[PDB]
Amino acid sequence: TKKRRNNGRAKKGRGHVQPIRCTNCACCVPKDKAIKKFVIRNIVEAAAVRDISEVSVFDAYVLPKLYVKLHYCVSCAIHSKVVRNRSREARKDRTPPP
Amino acid sequence: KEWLPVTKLGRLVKDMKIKSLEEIYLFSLPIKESEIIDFCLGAALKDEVLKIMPVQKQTRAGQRTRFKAFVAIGDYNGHVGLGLKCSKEVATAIRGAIILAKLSIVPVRRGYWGNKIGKPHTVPCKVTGRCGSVLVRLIPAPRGTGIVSAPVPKKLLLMAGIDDCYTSARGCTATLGNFAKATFDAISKTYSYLTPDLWKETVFTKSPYQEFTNHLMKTHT
């Protein structure tokens, strides 16, 4: 039985896209197939920003950010709880969760 | 014993103010009282249990066996019904499928093969009906042909007051519910077929909800 209409990927008029290597494993995943996050992240979380602000040389120093783009295989993504199994009606919602 | 009508239409039927269900079927009125058909065609209505079918749902502990009863009803002169009722015991299933059949009775238009003399004997045109995979085709036949058919639609067409008919089923007819429904869908579509007989532009007679709109206000709440 055809589960997903798009087939779980995002090529409609190609027939081939290039494989990315999954960041967690090294699995080769079609680019369109891969579950992609763009993690902007402060180099220090919450406990260390308290300390840097006080031990900074500079005057109200804005801290730099660490811009990763994570590519996951479907198996890695579900195991690491990035994506998740949904009900057959709720599968069709392409809205990203708030 | 004494029937008490709850719907608007049932109240008219009981008081002898709509005097034949021909008048109900003219306005496509949903019959939901069982005793409307027991009132009009009451003596010419005969019941044959087509099949008792045990169905089961798998539960924590064993199966929950309920019984599906197909009842074909109809007077051997114009009307057929087909009622399907699933229940825990067999007597409740049969009785419920008799009621659902009565509610569901339709009039069959019946025409002529070639020569148009006497009373009508056959289906007026080739009419297919279906549900599931089962496609049933009913074909007009000459007088005295009988109902050339499988024993299930033969049993409904007898009940429809059709003397003569050629059939031609298709798909999994072994599943009786589909086959009985498909042949009932086929005779349903006789008064839903626009022949040249039915071209004379419609004269809209007054509804029974309009003809007796002043009576219904006082007769009940």
């Binding site: - | 025409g111 002529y112 093969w113 070639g114 148009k116 007026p124 045109c125 080739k126 009419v127 007009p140 077929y193 626009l194 022949t195 040249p196 007989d197 071209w199």
Partner: protein, 129 residues
């Protein structure tokens, strides 16, 4: 490509009838399309149609009633003797009381009933009931 023009036209007015449209545009006008339609008109199945001359193959607008159950083509145009015409009206028409099988004879494009009168068989074009 477009090969049977009569086929395109008959299916077009069939799909328009099924929807419940009051008139339909059938894009290529032949002579055979007009004859078929006139035969359907004379038996009251369609209203007064009209052809639209652009200096090409014309278009026809047909005023549909709700009388036409189905309007079909038979492809290819099989060649029907008077003996065979009963076996075509047995397996291509619903009843023996109504419905017609239009066939091109040497006399002209006409229904099976006029073909029987004139004692002239011909090639089947299609049917309507």
């Amino acid at each position: 490509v477009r090969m049977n023009v009569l086929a395109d036209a008959l299916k077009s007015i069939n799909n328009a009838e099924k929807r419940g449209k009051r008139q339909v545009l059938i894009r290529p006008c032949s002579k055979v399309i007009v004859r078929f339609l006139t035969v359907m008109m004379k038996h009251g199945y369609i209203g007064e149609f009209e052809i639209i001359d652009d200096h090409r193959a014309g278009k026809i607008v047909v005023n549909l009633t709700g009388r036409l159950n189905k309007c079909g083509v038979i492809s290819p145009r099989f060649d029907v003797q008077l003996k065979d015409l009963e076996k075509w009206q047995n397996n291509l028409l619903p009843s023996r009381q109504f419905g017609f099988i239009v066939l091109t004879t040497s006399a002209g494009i006409m229904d099976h009933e006029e073909a029987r009168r004139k004692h002239t068989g011909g090639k089947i074009l299609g049917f309507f009931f």
